[PDB]
Design a protein around this ligand. Structure first.
Ligand SMILES: CC(=O)Oc1ccccc1C(=O)O
Ligand SMILES: [Ca+2]
Length: 121
């Protein structure tokens, strides 16, 4: 759920999910169109696509458990949905940490009219 995802983000990047990753670019948060603006936005695109592969799961509200084996994120056994949601979130958190160096505040609160086109998952 968003509760675990937000915590994973904070632990990984030192940034709070809201508002650093909730209105960034075209895909981070409310958002599903246009060309991703930068690496971080591409992380969100992939994350959206990952959730899209789970039509009969509820990733926003279904809670999963994860532990940290030293630095590594390890998803603990749960239902099939919880397992797959956790893997989507883990990937996004790592993607965010890998691209922190290019995170740009100019993409915060990005207006919707600047998100143009389509990218197919
Ligand atoms: C669901 C929502 O509106 O906000 C979020 C978007 C991305 C990551 C975390 C959150 C959140 O609310 O915690
Ligand atoms: Ca989105």
């Amino acid at each position: 759920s968003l509760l675990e995802f937000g915590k994973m983000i904070l632990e990984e990047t030192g940034k709070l999910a809201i508002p650093s990753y909730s209105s960034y670019g075209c895909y981070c948060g409310w958002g599903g169109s246009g060309t991703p603006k930068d690496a971080t936005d591409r992380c969100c695109f992939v994350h959206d696509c990952c959730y899209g592969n789970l039509p009969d799961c509820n990733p926003k509200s279904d809670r999963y458990k994860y532990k940290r084996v030293n630095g590594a994120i390890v998803c603990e056994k749960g239902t099939s949905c919880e397992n797959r949601i956790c893997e989507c979130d883990k990937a996004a958190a790592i993607c965010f940490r890998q691209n922190l160096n290019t995170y740009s505040k100019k993409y915060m609160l990005y207006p919707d009219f600047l998100c143009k086109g389509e990218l197919k998952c």
